[PDB]
């Protein structure tokens, strides 16, 4: 049934957002409302639309200035917070750019301030030739025309190319609208503005993977072994110009259908490129995804050779962790898709029971997927807030929580360990090896002497201090 | 040609690699140090969530801050109802809540929401709904297109003190000092508490952030809270005097309490290094009539003993760049010269240069330095990287962790100071001010240099009989 | 196949010794006594090199004298050098009260009769200084057995025997005796705070807090041990002895039990959380005093800090540890609490027959999920050679004379034990107790973090841990 938590008695609209799956229900009658307005004052976990454009998608690129048109805080706040390495020295993580909007610019306009800042950025780093300009709350409100500015800068600097995103934080309700605006703008303005050499009979784009701790680079070892050319990664370890070539691919392989389904859908519509949805987290999921890709291309045997070698290399360690993680209870409190990518994969491959899930910004689509794959007795929460997390802990008593670091540091006080479900602990977590990495961190999180020590009150004469025996795969 | 101390602005309009966050972030930091306080940030959701993450990076702890969740409708038609609902949702769900600083953002400053009017609405609504509670709503005007998190911190402290002392007024003299240490770590607060205890001086430290470093307890209780209460803030009207340690981080509240309540304010140099600590203690003795204790003479002497093992051997003539909050940059430059380091480049990150030019510590540096010093105001961290790229030779950087890649790539040892220091463990527990703090800064500098000598094989055999 | 194995060094010679010889440890014991100047009976290097070693660790001078054995004494015996040395000390240092007379390899080989010289000097001193008492303690420390660890223990025991022989049993003091072993001033400061917070009166033997002495306006020299004759004499009258170090003072606790019926309680050296917990439980047991809330809180702050590190940065990382035996075994237990894997433990002297009986071995055997090699009679070449043969380590914990092993192998290294001369201020930083466990864990993490930056090994990950 839908659940009215005690902490939500005075915001009873939250009942429509929390589903406890029970036997024999027709789940179509119990789909959480999702992607609706946030309730003010709740300590919702949601971020802003600008975040979804710059931090999540655009800022992954290795060769692009990220020009944030606004006051300095939006820039400061999106710098030193992500773990998306590159193969060029992590340019994307080292720098952030602001137009340093001041009061004058609010009153009289910021277009000249943006123009000057763009020329300065290109002058300070002459080997960087690509830029994305983002609006933020106040530059949207005052109506600065960033597309016109970008057009002028490109006329004045024939060596550069600039893309613009109109993504103030108050757009939409969450990060999600930033994903949408960036996807649609990119396909409308930049796809089919360049081409690259095709060097394989088999070509694809990999859509919706952001190279967290090197995920994309690990998956690329598969594509290289299979002889498949990736035209563009959207956007993990990617380049601006590769994204201009996306119309050339034969296949679009989608992992993050939430942030990046939009562009896959438009590429299918405009160019006829099929959309294949996979799960690139999960051990047996990864095998299924490789088999689908190889079946599409007619290279089934190459796929079987790869899968056999990866199972021989990694399945024994995975099974060691499954033996020790069987029956452990997990919560997943992340953006949305990892709920449906992980609930059944940790169950199948690790024996782990996901007892509670919360999505910051998922849509009803995401809840359809997670509820289809998820257990009975589990809580499914749209746009969860901090007091709800405490009540859910009291209801389901998780052994481990996959969530962001700040919430991890909160639940530590309750003696509950965490794994960073966003930026990982010791990743990558995609692929065969990556699911072993995920399992290892879950194992070390839960089988942790400090948890046991913390429970002991040394003042209690009846208590001793235990020693715990651990293992390694 | 005599040494010159030169102030100059950043020569670019834009920013690359900002040194500070925006005003609302600093207002949030001020508020999280108050017991039974949840700041409410009136604007889009990122303005809250990114700052809660920033605090988690520095402290490795959660702090509670709420958003009004400005969306499209409210951006176009006004956000008063988002404020008003957010205050009520907080009060309904947090029965012990007492203080809500209502912090504006760029968005809600641009659209001109009437925060004082929303507070009147909310006060009416809260008095009807909760006749047995008193919740203090403080209007905090922090447009992000002026100043920085430094100015936003100062503005929020001042507004919260105005709000609470307006309600309570002046009463029974307390016999206590007010102390505004500025934006410091828990370890700095621990040290100040010890100094006041050893000198038998009663004081309130605003804000008391000691418990930000909270235990993991057998009973699972959460103690990660500010310790400064409504009552403590209200009592500031009754103090003997205010000791303001930070010109840019709370002195304006000391000034307000002097103007409103005749509490005399004493602004001193921020106590980085030996002389500044000595002069702070002399001021405390003057205002209180209490003697400086032998215990502090001894702590001072242990610090000097430790620093004397380092200064002429390892520090003399080494060139340093320092960035961070202005009180910290200027104070660390003075500390550096006590130990024979040469702070040749000081970077201060905001638009307050008209004030910095009048800081008496500039003149103190002009009258002491034997080497040129460039003080860049309105600086970003690209101002540092570009100068190194152009040939500036540095032996040490002192600054916060968002400058780390500058030091890493240039192969320059860096000591992490100020806020945020997320890329090393435990620094929030270390003092940087006072005598113990001077000692621990100097030993961090030496140990950073020593490790660098080993990694680079630069006379690494010399670390034996120093 | 899960095995903790003890083995000896397989070479007769030493390359890169882990410890100094017995007389050096006896000197260290003595310099913690107020109004004490040890007299080292042997050649001059046996004194001067050890005064240098203490200056390397502490960055301070300590006073120790030599008998200056020369060629004539090597032929005819050196008793007259002892006797002269005692009188020259007494005549030139009017406040001197205690002289441990420490033998060396030379004076052990030639068989000088130290006890006979002490009788001569006691008669001379009583005649020449009628209103003074100087305690001469014979300390037999041949360097061709044991190590500075054994020498420390021997000197403490001899000094206590000498002083308590002279004063005997008096009125009950209500205090604990505490022998922390060979620890830093910072460890002593932490223990004093624990006993203060628990409202337990205690003497810490020796009290080395003031080794970290101020540079004072009045130019006063305060770099002295604080343990007095009176403090040592009062050990006879204690409620109980708490011995923290099996190899570094427990034998003095036993002597006081045998002689004065002061019950001795030997506990695991308090490295890490459990060992600290168990120390405090023993204190509570023997005193009847409750463990205070303040120590529950310090414990919780340490656990909170270590929990930010253990599964993220420490789990499955392989560690080698060297140092004094009580420190090595205690740090191995601490390592395990934070998910580190101490695969190689090196203990540097000939006391293997004792180490095989240490109950902490069994505590490791019953807990480790990885093989542990414990090499006794080890030198530091035992570490370097194993690394050269392929042993993969993520961390070394040990004293500064191992530094080049870590530097050349490019392995991060945390400086622990004695001497730690190649970093600043470590003598002031506790390693024992809850705050010490936290400080050690954060040194480990910060050494790893710097290493990640210098080697460009996922250095971008240090943002949102
Ligand atoms: S919801 Fe998002 S992060 Fe917020 S402002 Fe809006 S685009 Fe940006 Fe920016 S400068 Fe500071 S952090 Fe805000 S108050 Fe403005
Ligand atoms: S005066 Fe010189 S240093 Fe002294 S012993 Fe003689 S040659 Fe040597 Fe050696 S082992 Fe220790 S330090 Fe001595 S007691 Fe013997
Ligand atoms: Mg000293
Ligand atoms: Mg903590």
mmCIF file of N, CA, C and O in Angstrom, chain A residues 7-8 38 40-41 44 47 71-73 76-77 79-80 94-98 100-103 113 117 120 124 170 172-173 385-387 406 409 413-415 454 456, chain B residues 10 12-18 20-21 45 49 52 56-57 60-62 64 67 69 71-72 82 89-90 93 144-145 214 217-218 220 351 382 385-386 402 409 420:
data_model
loop_
_atom_site.group_PDB
_atom_site.id
_atom_site.type_symbol
_atom_site.label_atom_id
_atom_site.label_comp_id
_atom_site.label_asym_id
_atom_site.label_seq_id
_atom_site.Cartn_x
_atom_site.Cartn_y
_atom_site.Cartn_z
ATOM 1 N N UNK A 7 6.487 10.866 10.459
ATOM 2 C CA UNK A 7 7.159 12.148 10.281
ATOM 3 C C UNK A 7 6.490 12.980 9.188
ATOM 4 O O UNK A 7 6.821 14.178 9.087
ATOM 5 N N UNK A 8 5.549 12.412 8.447
ATOM 6 C CA UNK A 8 4.844 13.119 7.361
ATOM 7 C C UNK A 8 3.385 13.414 7.730
ATOM 8 O O UNK A 8 2.654 13.848 6.862
ATOM 9 N N UNK A 38 8.787 19.967 -5.420
ATOM 10 C CA UNK A 38 9.286 19.666 -4.084
ATOM 11 C C UNK A 38 8.464 20.418 -3.022
ATOM 12 O O UNK A 38 8.002 21.542 -3.296
ATOM 13 N N UNK A 40 8.597 22.737 0.063
ATOM 14 C CA UNK A 40 9.594 23.576 0.751
ATOM 15 C C UNK A 40 9.803 23.112 2.188
ATOM 16 O O UNK A 40 8.862 22.716 2.877
ATOM 17 N N UNK A 41 11.039 23.265 2.664
ATOM 18 C CA UNK A 41 11.331 23.090 4.086
ATOM 19 C C UNK A 41 11.485 21.652 4.526
ATOM 20 O O UNK A 41 11.582 21.425 5.733
ATOM 21 N N UNK A 44 14.405 17.658 1.506
ATOM 22 C CA UNK A 44 14.531 16.894 0.283
ATOM 23 C C UNK A 44 16.009 16.793 -0.113
ATOM 24 O O UNK A 44 16.769 17.743 0.128
ATOM 25 N N UNK A 47 18.691 18.436 -5.947
ATOM 26 C CA UNK A 47 19.468 19.537 -6.416
ATOM 27 C C UNK A 47 18.734 20.345 -7.498
ATOM 28 O O UNK A 47 17.505 20.251 -7.606
ATOM 29 N N UNK A 71 26.678 34.412 -10.840
ATOM 30 C CA UNK A 71 27.559 34.763 -9.757
ATOM 31 C C UNK A 71 28.443 33.554 -9.423
ATOM 32 O O UNK A 71 28.207 32.438 -9.866
ATOM 33 N N UNK A 72 29.465 33.810 -8.601
ATOM 34 C CA UNK A 72 30.542 32.815 -8.457
ATOM 35 C C UNK A 72 30.146 31.545 -7.761
ATOM 36 O O UNK A 72 30.830 30.526 -7.913
ATOM 37 N N UNK A 73 29.055 31.527 -6.972
ATOM 38 C CA UNK A 73 28.778 30.343 -6.155
ATOM 39 C C UNK A 73 28.406 29.137 -6.961
ATOM 40 O O UNK A 73 28.765 28.004 -6.614
ATOM 41 N N UNK A 76 31.767 27.646 -7.896
ATOM 42 C CA UNK A 76 32.442 27.064 -6.749
ATOM 43 C C UNK A 76 31.814 25.754 -6.361
ATOM 44 O O UNK A 76 32.505 24.772 -6.016
ATOM 45 N N UNK A 77 30.486 25.722 -6.373
ATOM 46 C CA UNK A 77 29.706 24.589 -5.875
ATOM 47 C C UNK A 77 29.744 23.364 -6.741
ATOM 48 O O UNK A 77 29.311 22.305 -6.265
ATOM 49 N N UNK A 79 32.638 22.210 -8.314
ATOM 50 C CA UNK A 79 34.086 22.065 -8.517
ATOM 51 C C UNK A 79 34.653 21.346 -7.301
ATOM 52 O O UNK A 79 34.365 21.733 -6.146
ATOM 53 N N UNK A 80 35.431 20.293 -7.530
ATOM 54 C CA UNK A 80 35.967 19.389 -6.485
ATOM 55 C C UNK A 80 34.894 18.505 -5.884
ATOM 56 O O UNK A 80 35.036 18.076 -4.733
ATOM 57 N N UNK A 94 39.943 19.802 -12.776
ATOM 58 C CA UNK A 94 40.871 20.820 -12.275
ATOM 59 C C UNK A 94 40.293 22.224 -12.343
ATOM 60 O O UNK A 94 40.765 23.063 -11.567
ATOM 61 N N UNK A 95 39.371 22.502 -13.225
ATOM 62 C CA UNK A 95 38.963 23.874 -13.513
ATOM 63 C C UNK A 95 37.466 24.042 -13.477
ATOM 64 O O UNK A 95 36.714 23.154 -13.843
ATOM 65 N N UNK A 96 37.070 25.267 -13.126
ATOM 66 C CA UNK A 96 35.704 25.746 -13.308
ATOM 67 C C UNK A 96 35.770 27.217 -13.627
ATOM 68 O O UNK A 96 36.711 27.911 -13.223
ATOM 69 N N UNK A 97 34.778 27.729 -14.372
ATOM 70 C CA UNK A 97 34.780 29.097 -14.882
ATOM 71 C C UNK A 97 33.468 29.764 -14.519
ATOM 72 O O UNK A 97 32.403 29.169 -14.596
ATOM 73 N N UNK A 98 33.568 31.054 -14.137
ATOM 74 C CA UNK A 98 32.411 31.867 -13.820
ATOM 75 C C UNK A 98 32.514 33.196 -14.536
ATOM 76 O O UNK A 98 33.609 33.749 -14.671
ATOM 77 N N UNK A 100 31.355 35.712 -12.914
ATOM 78 C CA UNK A 100 31.476 36.574 -11.722
ATOM 79 C C UNK A 100 30.485 37.721 -11.810
ATOM 80 O O UNK A 100 30.838 38.879 -11.584
ATOM 81 N N UNK A 101 29.209 37.381 -12.001
ATOM 82 C CA UNK A 101 28.185 38.404 -12.094
ATOM 83 C C UNK A 101 28.179 39.276 -10.842
ATOM 84 O O UNK A 101 28.249 38.785 -9.702
ATOM 85 N N UNK A 102 27.999 40.573 -11.075
ATOM 86 C CA UNK A 102 27.900 41.568 -9.997
ATOM 87 C C UNK A 102 26.546 42.285 -10.112
ATOM 88 O O UNK A 102 25.770 42.096 -11.040
ATOM 89 N N UNK A 103 26.287 43.167 -9.140
ATOM 90 C CA UNK A 103 25.003 43.874 -9.119
ATOM 91 C C UNK A 103 24.768 44.692 -10.390
ATOM 92 O O UNK A 103 23.668 44.756 -10.890
ATOM 93 N N UNK A 113 29.625 41.118 -19.989
ATOM 94 C CA UNK A 113 30.408 40.405 -18.970
ATOM 95 C C UNK A 113 30.649 38.956 -19.406
ATOM 96 O O UNK A 113 31.793 38.477 -19.285
ATOM 97 N N UNK A 117 34.348 37.393 -20.472
ATOM 98 C CA UNK A 117 34.800 36.198 -19.756
ATOM 99 C C UNK A 117 35.118 35.073 -20.747
ATOM 100 O O UNK A 117 36.074 34.321 -20.524
ATOM 101 N N UNK A 120 38.419 35.853 -22.362
ATOM 102 C CA UNK A 120 39.476 35.630 -21.390
ATOM 103 C C UNK A 120 39.779 34.143 -21.245
ATOM 104 O O UNK A 120 40.948 33.756 -21.190
ATOM 105 N N UNK A 124 43.400 32.540 -21.952
ATOM 106 C CA UNK A 124 44.208 31.987 -20.863
ATOM 107 C C UNK A 124 44.639 30.575 -21.202
ATOM 108 O O UNK A 124 45.653 30.131 -20.658
ATOM 109 N N UNK A 170 16.075 26.961 -10.881
ATOM 110 C CA UNK A 170 14.642 26.867 -10.613
ATOM 111 C C UNK A 170 13.849 26.265 -11.751
ATOM 112 O O UNK A 170 12.629 26.081 -11.591
ATOM 113 N N UNK A 172 12.236 23.325 -13.913
ATOM 114 C CA UNK A 172 11.820 22.021 -13.455
ATOM 115 C C UNK A 172 11.713 21.964 -11.958
ATOM 116 O O UNK A 172 11.306 22.918 -11.315
ATOM 117 N N UNK A 173 12.046 20.808 -11.397
ATOM 118 C CA UNK A 173 11.912 20.530 -9.968
ATOM 119 C C UNK A 173 13.168 19.934 -9.364
ATOM 120 O O UNK A 173 13.178 19.614 -8.172
ATOM 121 N N UNK A 385 13.092 12.577 2.047
ATOM 122 C CA UNK A 385 13.682 13.633 2.868
ATOM 123 C C UNK A 385 14.276 13.028 4.140
ATOM 124 O O UNK A 385 14.068 11.870 4.478
ATOM 125 N N UNK A 386 15.053 13.854 4.841
ATOM 126 C CA UNK A 386 15.917 13.345 5.898
ATOM 127 C C UNK A 386 15.134 12.650 7.030
ATOM 128 O O UNK A 386 15.512 11.575 7.480
ATOM 129 N N UNK A 387 14.042 13.261 7.489
ATOM 130 C CA UNK A 387 13.296 12.616 8.594
ATOM 131 C C UNK A 387 12.712 11.285 8.109
ATOM 132 O O UNK A 387 12.627 10.316 8.892
ATOM 133 N N UNK A 406 27.382 12.701 2.508
ATOM 134 C CA UNK A 406 26.821 13.408 3.659
ATOM 135 C C UNK A 406 25.800 12.539 4.414
ATOM 136 O O UNK A 406 25.786 12.497 5.632
ATOM 137 N N UNK A 409 27.605 9.937 6.342
ATOM 138 C CA UNK A 409 28.160 10.447 7.605
ATOM 139 C C UNK A 409 27.070 10.630 8.639
ATOM 140 O O UNK A 409 27.375 10.592 9.856
ATOM 141 N N UNK A 413 26.293 7.606 12.596
ATOM 142 C CA UNK A 413 25.986 7.833 14.013
ATOM 143 C C UNK A 413 25.062 6.729 14.581
ATOM 144 O O UNK A 413 25.063 6.485 15.761
ATOM 145 N N UNK A 414 24.302 6.111 13.686
ATOM 146 C CA UNK A 414 23.380 5.023 14.008
ATOM 147 C C UNK A 414 24.062 3.677 13.845
ATOM 148 O O UNK A 414 23.419 2.616 13.929
ATOM 149 N N UNK A 415 25.366 3.689 13.575
ATOM 150 C CA UNK A 415 26.181 2.501 13.430
ATOM 151 C C UNK A 415 25.860 1.755 12.147
ATOM 152 O O UNK A 415 26.129 0.542 12.043
ATOM 153 N N UNK A 454 31.910 0.389 18.269
ATOM 154 C CA UNK A 454 31.100 1.565 18.599
ATOM 155 C C UNK A 454 29.927 1.222 19.489
ATOM 156 O O UNK A 454 29.490 2.089 20.250
ATOM 157 N N UNK A 456 29.854 -0.901 21.950
ATOM 158 C CA UNK A 456 30.249 -1.239 23.326
ATOM 159 C C UNK A 456 30.285 0.016 24.175
ATOM 160 O O UNK A 456 30.992 0.968 23.804
ATOM 161 N N UNK B 10 42.681 41.479 -9.405
ATOM 162 C CA UNK B 10 42.642 40.590 -10.561
ATOM 163 C C UNK B 10 42.406 41.437 -11.804
ATOM 164 O O UNK B 10 41.508 42.269 -11.804
ATOM 165 N N UNK B 12 41.319 40.292 -14.846
ATOM 166 C CA UNK B 12 40.252 39.665 -15.630
ATOM 167 C C UNK B 12 38.877 39.972 -15.072
ATOM 168 O O UNK B 12 38.752 40.019 -13.822
ATOM 169 N N UNK B 13 37.894 40.080 -15.918
ATOM 170 C CA UNK B 13 36.504 40.189 -15.473
ATOM 171 C C UNK B 13 35.985 38.875 -14.935
ATOM 172 O O UNK B 13 35.283 38.863 -13.913
ATOM 173 N N UNK B 14 36.237 37.791 -15.625
ATOM 174 C CA UNK B 14 35.756 36.486 -15.195
ATOM 175 C C UNK B 14 36.603 35.883 -14.105
ATOM 176 O O UNK B 14 37.658 36.415 -13.731
ATOM 177 N N UNK B 15 36.129 34.771 -13.597
ATOM 178 C CA UNK B 15 36.810 33.940 -12.609
ATOM 179 C C UNK B 15 37.154 32.598 -13.210
ATOM 180 O O UNK B 15 36.316 31.969 -13.882
ATOM 181 N N UNK B 16 38.337 32.116 -12.892
ATOM 182 C CA UNK B 16 38.734 30.712 -13.115
ATOM 183 C C UNK B 16 39.157 30.203 -11.758
ATOM 184 O O UNK B 16 40.078 30.759 -11.159
ATOM 185 N N UNK B 17 38.465 29.194 -11.243
ATOM 186 C CA UNK B 17 38.821 28.548 -9.976
ATOM 187 C C UNK B 17 38.593 29.479 -8.788
ATOM 188 O O UNK B 17 39.536 29.993 -8.163
ATOM 189 N N UNK B 18 37.331 29.742 -8.444
ATOM 190 C CA UNK B 18 37.018 30.691 -7.351
ATOM 191 C C UNK B 18 37.603 30.263 -6.023
ATOM 192 O O UNK B 18 37.558 29.112 -5.625
ATOM 193 N N UNK B 20 36.488 31.493 -2.975
ATOM 194 C CA UNK B 20 35.400 31.428 -2.005
ATOM 195 C C UNK B 20 34.114 31.024 -2.728
ATOM 196 O O UNK B 20 33.976 31.162 -3.930
ATOM 197 N N UNK B 21 33.149 30.589 -1.903
ATOM 198 C CA UNK B 21 31.784 30.435 -2.324
ATOM 199 C C UNK B 21 31.053 31.779 -2.204
ATOM 200 O O UNK B 21 31.626 32.798 -1.831
ATOM 201 N N UNK B 45 17.199 24.917 -5.380
ATOM 202 C CA UNK B 45 17.628 23.829 -4.513
ATOM 203 C C UNK B 45 19.136 23.664 -4.456
ATOM 204 O O UNK B 45 19.637 23.164 -3.414
ATOM 205 N N UNK B 49 21.745 22.429 -1.413
ATOM 206 C CA UNK B 49 22.327 21.081 -1.398
ATOM 207 C C UNK B 49 23.817 21.117 -1.632
ATOM 208 O O UNK B 49 24.564 20.336 -0.993
ATOM 209 N N UNK B 52 25.453 22.065 1.739
ATOM 210 C CA UNK B 52 25.488 20.927 2.684
ATOM 211 C C UNK B 52 26.617 19.962 2.279
ATOM 212 O O UNK B 52 27.284 19.410 3.175
ATOM 213 N N UNK B 56 30.012 18.832 4.459
ATOM 214 C CA UNK B 56 30.384 17.430 4.585
ATOM 215 C C UNK B 56 31.808 17.204 4.123
ATOM 216 O O UNK B 56 32.536 16.378 4.696
ATOM 217 N N UNK B 57 32.252 17.887 3.083
ATOM 218 C CA UNK B 57 33.640 17.741 2.649
ATOM 219 C C UNK B 57 34.595 18.223 3.732
ATOM 220 O O UNK B 57 35.601 17.552 4.007
ATOM 221 N N UNK B 60 33.360 16.208 7.378
ATOM 222 C CA UNK B 60 32.934 14.807 7.324
ATOM 223 C C UNK B 60 31.700 14.580 8.214
ATOM 224 O O UNK B 60 31.536 13.540 8.824
ATOM 225 N N UNK B 61 30.805 15.570 8.206
ATOM 226 C CA UNK B 61 29.541 15.493 8.953
ATOM 227 C C UNK B 61 28.418 16.110 8.166
ATOM 228 O O UNK B 61 28.609 17.033 7.355
ATOM 229 N N UNK B 62 27.219 15.610 8.452
ATOM 230 C CA UNK B 62 25.968 16.222 8.023
ATOM 231 C C UNK B 62 25.612 17.421 8.887
ATOM 232 O O UNK B 62 25.708 17.324 10.120
ATOM 233 N N UNK B 64 22.109 20.176 9.011
ATOM 234 C CA UNK B 64 20.742 20.397 8.516
ATOM 235 C C UNK B 64 20.552 21.837 8.067
ATOM 236 O O UNK B 64 20.683 22.793 8.828
ATOM 237 N N UNK B 67 15.758 24.117 2.082
ATOM 238 C CA UNK B 67 15.513 24.972 0.907
ATOM 239 C C UNK B 67 14.052 25.381 0.856
ATOM 240 O O UNK B 67 13.171 24.617 1.234
ATOM 241 N N UNK B 69 12.957 25.672 -2.195
ATOM 242 C CA UNK B 69 12.603 25.010 -3.468
ATOM 243 C C UNK B 69 11.904 25.965 -4.422
ATOM 244 O O UNK B 69 10.810 25.668 -4.946
ATOM 245 N N UNK B 71 10.813 27.219 -7.755
ATOM 246 C CA UNK B 71 10.596 26.577 -9.059
ATOM 247 C C UNK B 71 10.151 27.673 -10.030
ATOM 248 O O UNK B 71 10.140 28.857 -9.712
ATOM 249 N N UNK B 72 9.796 27.276 -11.260
ATOM 250 C CA UNK B 72 9.487 28.217 -12.366
ATOM 251 C C UNK B 72 8.361 29.185 -11.977
ATOM 252 O O UNK B 72 8.386 30.366 -12.253
ATOM 253 N N UNK B 82 6.621 30.178 -1.001
ATOM 254 C CA UNK B 82 7.624 29.118 -0.769
ATOM 255 C C UNK B 82 8.290 29.348 0.565
ATOM 256 O O UNK B 82 8.539 28.380 1.302
ATOM 257 N N UNK B 89 6.552 24.145 7.424
ATOM 258 C CA UNK B 89 6.932 22.740 7.305
ATOM 259 C C UNK B 89 8.091 22.438 8.261
ATOM 260 O O UNK B 89 8.122 21.346 8.874
ATOM 261 N N UNK B 90 9.042 23.328 8.371
ATOM 262 C CA UNK B 90 10.111 23.163 9.377
ATOM 263 C C UNK B 90 9.532 23.103 10.765
ATOM 264 O O UNK B 90 9.856 22.203 11.553
ATOM 265 N N UNK B 93 7.604 19.857 11.615
ATOM 266 C CA UNK B 93 8.305 18.572 11.592
ATOM 267 C C UNK B 93 9.484 18.544 12.568
ATOM 268 O O UNK B 93 9.967 17.437 12.851
ATOM 269 N N UNK B 144 24.198 36.884 -4.007
ATOM 270 C CA UNK B 144 25.485 36.253 -4.311
ATOM 271 C C UNK B 144 26.317 37.046 -5.273
ATOM 272 O O UNK B 144 27.492 36.716 -5.454
ATOM 273 N N UNK B 145 25.729 38.058 -5.895
ATOM 274 C CA UNK B 145 26.413 38.919 -6.849
ATOM 275 C C UNK B 145 27.106 40.095 -6.146
ATOM 276 O O UNK B 145 27.572 41.008 -6.826
ATOM 277 N N UNK B 214 31.719 15.273 16.287
ATOM 278 C CA UNK B 214 30.860 14.569 17.206
ATOM 279 C C UNK B 214 31.261 13.097 17.297
ATOM 280 O O UNK B 214 31.717 12.467 16.325
ATOM 281 N N UNK B 217 28.554 7.163 19.260
ATOM 282 C CA UNK B 217 28.327 6.784 20.658
ATOM 283 C C UNK B 217 27.617 5.454 20.754
ATOM 284 O O UNK B 217 26.834 5.078 19.879
ATOM 285 N N UNK B 218 27.791 4.730 21.869
ATOM 286 C CA UNK B 218 27.099 3.454 22.027
ATOM 287 C C UNK B 218 25.585 3.587 21.892
ATOM 288 O O UNK B 218 24.966 2.667 21.360
ATOM 289 N N UNK B 220 23.888 5.590 20.012
ATOM 290 C CA UNK B 220 23.475 6.018 18.660
ATOM 291 C C UNK B 220 22.966 7.454 18.644
ATOM 292 O O UNK B 220 22.382 7.885 17.659
ATOM 293 N N UNK B 351 35.568 41.059 -3.609
ATOM 294 C CA UNK B 351 35.426 42.438 -4.054
ATOM 295 C C UNK B 351 35.546 43.463 -2.954
ATOM 296 O O UNK B 351 35.162 44.632 -3.169
ATOM 297 N N UNK B 382 43.256 30.788 -10.278
ATOM 298 C CA UNK B 382 44.010 30.898 -11.532
ATOM 299 C C UNK B 382 45.072 31.956 -11.392
ATOM 300 O O UNK B 382 46.160 31.850 -11.970
ATOM 301 N N UNK B 385 48.053 30.022 -10.177
ATOM 302 C CA UNK B 385 48.561 29.080 -11.178
ATOM 303 C C UNK B 385 49.250 29.844 -12.305
ATOM 304 O O UNK B 385 50.337 29.430 -12.749
ATOM 305 N N UNK B 386 48.663 30.917 -12.772
ATOM 306 C CA UNK B 386 49.236 31.695 -13.862
ATOM 307 C C UNK B 386 50.564 32.301 -13.457
ATOM 308 O O UNK B 386 51.507 32.356 -14.270
ATOM 309 N N UNK B 402 40.694 23.404 -2.301
ATOM 310 C CA UNK B 402 40.345 23.596 -3.707
ATOM 311 C C UNK B 402 41.510 24.135 -4.520
ATOM 312 O O UNK B 402 41.405 24.153 -5.759
ATOM 313 N N UNK B 409 50.459 19.771 -9.349
ATOM 314 C CA UNK B 409 51.065 19.772 -10.679
ATOM 315 C C UNK B 409 52.376 20.558 -10.678
ATOM 316 O O UNK B 409 53.333 20.117 -11.352
ATOM 317 N N UNK B 420 37.661 25.087 2.521
ATOM 318 C CA UNK B 420 37.548 23.770 3.138
ATOM 319 C C UNK B 420 38.860 22.996 3.021
ATOM 320 O O UNK B 420 39.573 23.149 2.015
#
